[PDB]
């Protein structure tokens, strides 16, 4: 009898690895409802003999038994090969088994697209399927994904404390977002302001305010003093994936200011549905509203982040599918 | 502004009250889930003042705050008057409420039906309703139950540690119910035993075998041990019948045996679709396939009972709704 | 007979109440622990019958059982008369009290004193108690404590997930209390700057700068950037600063840095022995220390209060006491 | 640095494995404290290669960050080279560590005494250590153990819900040890009736009744009934037997019955200034001290056993030990 419920969580990255951060604060949230770790170290992977990965992986594994349910965040990051034989691994246990995705890599672009087949492979030994969009799983599907139960993520939860500020309506735009990944920045032609928060030691177009990393916690708080919460992405290419879920998007509206976001995202309806922010279509569509916008027009649309957010405050989004995925994978 | 989680819970009904314990089981859940106790304890209100009586709710509601989260399991059983006091108080404070219907007061016996109509006005002030089942909605509706976003409970939990014996196939048929509420039982007609757990002594067709009420875990030991769980019952109440969850088909599954259940239940659908046992018209169909089934079609079922019990054994259709129900309460 | 365990904890109070703020955060580990809140509203009390509140009284316990455990958090800040009345209530249920002590309000300013036999006689009804220091159970046993099992709290956590930046060296010294119960801070002579984090603006000398109250998350981020926290009180409290826990003590050494505590105070040896700033027995002993101090000392002084404050941080001196209350109170 | 705490949990024994079961359940405690498992397999170490084997660990420990605390429950039962380089590993993270002991191997028997400077040599890398009785700490120091913080455990909790029946006065003594490592049993000679519960099939003298294994569970409603509980050694193991802390006495006290204990053992203070049952000098002792009893003195015996296994069932003596363990890890 006495079922348990494990959830893996990889560990080793760069403090700014916002794979593994996510991967961590879902796991805050399992081990709160009771779950527990299954801790997966990032290295790389043939610097291991077949066997020594194997025994490693029973190392992982120790804790479980004919009982369980796992949680498997994928990807492991230790490479495809890696996923494949955790889940052998995990498939030779009696258990059932959700697969949480964060990432599909051979969608991440195309000619990695190869990997599908082995990638949807692994997929569907799977009980349970977590994806961010409706529109994930749908093309999941096209490739073969099988399996039968399936949970929706929505939305990134930002579990915090951080202190919101009485928010002034400043005509800024923030955006926590390595430079490097998009273009769009160093394109900046507009008269409004970019706060760009990022480690990357480099200079940017002259209306482009560059500010040094700082923690989460402390970037929450300022960002509460007012301002729009930029979700643009990835510049041109690595577009398609209106798939995933948005980090940064969590981490603004959990400061407590509306967001800005590209038509197309991932579960936009959330955004409307709750008054989040703007969804417009081009930059420059942007400037123009946060130009052209009435003060208590930016009034309400902070008051309802703030009514919306503590969902994404106190992680709820999160509870949700570490809830339904597990009873799914039993009914 | 913190967001914290209360939910209401019962307390000072008897040891064999099944209203209070499946509330207090539910609250236990939401304890471990972080919710917090809003306590309250049954007694006639007609002793409080329409005053002291206020201040009595106003020091069960002490530790709320502006926009927390309060699931008010309902009915409290200190009568309407209170339900929609307690009610009232929680719409001073600036939150979002979610109703977990228990039982519907005036549905319940056609006494007080009456009363409907108060129970529906306090009901469509909450922002979201946890009820038994989707039948139970759509009737509540009818009534003008104008509440937008709803959301299924589906099937009482029976969280428990309690070993599950192996199953073996006695041709007997369990059932803990009071006799004179479902009066079905004065009736039995047919050679297969009844076995009844209850308070009240001395009534006994013949083959109707009965025991004294013993605690839930030894209860749920010795059902282990073989047999088949009966959810029944009177045509007394084959409309409510059809709404609300039994605890004890819940408290049968969880001690890994399979149920015998009348067709037209609410959620047949989780005892089919799970094979938990066979959906049936009247009694006699029932005693038939008892008869008729032989040892290996049983043993599918309880693996299948018992492939599926640790959901309600680690109290996940409440965690369910405990943490949706949070949750559609903020979202739109 | 299932034994759950309860706690007290006040509300209402204005945010920039330290007393509801290190009741809410005590009560927010003890909930994490599984125990449960007892939510008390504070209000000015004689608005109330003595049979309403009573009822009121009822309100906030209905949750009880027989054979359950409760922390009182005391005082409640709603007069002795409540706590009084309160305890009353509790002893009329099987249970056991672990009374925690935040603050013994006779001993704290003068003209407070006539409640002390009375104060007295309430302490005396509950099994185990918890005190801030050794020195403060010897002086309530002087005065009448006739509890037999007591247990230290030793200091306040400060429960936080805030950054703590780069500290070192500014050589300026931390104080965020409200500068009119601690007026050593208006005859402030010396070179080094104090900043004052606090709700007025009321007076100013020189080399006195002042903070608007910031967000306690703000503030310890900020005080980790360097300078010293300074542990003080007005020399007409020293009676009591040689007994309680004081609540910035914590909250300095959570952001990480070292602090400036006066000789006498209570449960200094925890200062050090973990080696967390100075012992010093005058302001000026300590301007003395703050100035001649070597970059390098600071350095591993920092050092010393990081290798240390994750107990304060994620709650340990609170889940000290929190479990080994509720087991003294059980064992003999 | 954000403070995670861990804790070692053996896996894959036979279900009758007393290690494994009481590992298990300090990690369930520990896991409702918010620490975290590190899984550990039981296996024949000898086909690991060094390689092999640090790469096995490296996959158990992956979790595992600087500013961490580890509590490692030895011995893992992988052998001490097992021990030793699990140790090895734990120390290259900057992380404070608990030793938590449930065997010493070395003190088993003679002989296996050489095994003492290597298994010395690895606890004292340890912060502080965790053992079940003072008298365990003071031999360990007697050869080496250096680490200056300790911790005593007292006594098994037993975290459960049976339901404990209505206690009769059975002049009887219940047991369930296995025979094989229990030969004071084949010498049963007295009058008074032995409740042996051992999963094993070998006939058994006159006055002794033998009972197949049965869930832990349903063992303790059965003892829950009435009796006595016997905690006996052998006399040989005898020795290192006064330093345990036996799993089968918490058994009973759980289920609500006296015991009766052989003089001298760990922790016997806990069994006299509670009233859990009698200390007595030899087997004799207790049939006469059993046979010699008043009803009276039993409701006695027994209503303080019930008095105060809430303890042990709610699991405080764990408690007590996982939150301060970790405490005096951090604090000097
Ligand atoms: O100075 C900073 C800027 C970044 N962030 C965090 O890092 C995330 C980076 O977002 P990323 O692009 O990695 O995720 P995405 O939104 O693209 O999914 C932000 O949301 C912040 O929470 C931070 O902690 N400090
Ligand atoms: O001897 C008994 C008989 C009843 N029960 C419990 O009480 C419940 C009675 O079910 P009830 O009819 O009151 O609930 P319903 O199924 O009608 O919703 C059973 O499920 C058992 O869990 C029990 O613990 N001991
Ligand atoms: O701007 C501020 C200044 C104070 N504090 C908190 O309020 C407490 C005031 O301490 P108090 O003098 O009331 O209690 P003591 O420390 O003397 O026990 C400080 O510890 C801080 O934690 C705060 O939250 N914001
Ligand atoms: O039928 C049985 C017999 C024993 N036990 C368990 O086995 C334990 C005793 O094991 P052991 O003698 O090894 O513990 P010790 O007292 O020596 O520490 C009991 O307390 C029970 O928990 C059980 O579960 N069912």
New interface residues.
Partial sequence: ???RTYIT?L??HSITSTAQIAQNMVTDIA????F??????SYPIDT??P???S???????????KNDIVIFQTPTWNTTTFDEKLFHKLKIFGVKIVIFIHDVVPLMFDGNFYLMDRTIAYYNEADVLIAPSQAMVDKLQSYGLTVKKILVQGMWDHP?????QAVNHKKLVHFPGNPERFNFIKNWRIPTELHVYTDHNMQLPTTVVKEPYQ?D??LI?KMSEGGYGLVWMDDRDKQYQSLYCPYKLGAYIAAGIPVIIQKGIANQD?IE??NLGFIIEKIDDISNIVESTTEEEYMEIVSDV???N??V??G??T??LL??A??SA??
Avoid: W
């Fill in positions: 009898a006495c079922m969580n560990n080793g081990v709160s409802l009771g527990r770790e299954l801790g997966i170290h291991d003999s066997e020594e990965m025994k490693r992986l029973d190392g992982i594994c120790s804790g479980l038994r915090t404390n951080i202190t919101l923690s916690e402390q708080m959330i549905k709750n703030r009514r919306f503590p969902l405050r106190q709820y989004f509870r949700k809830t339904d597990v009873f039993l009914n």
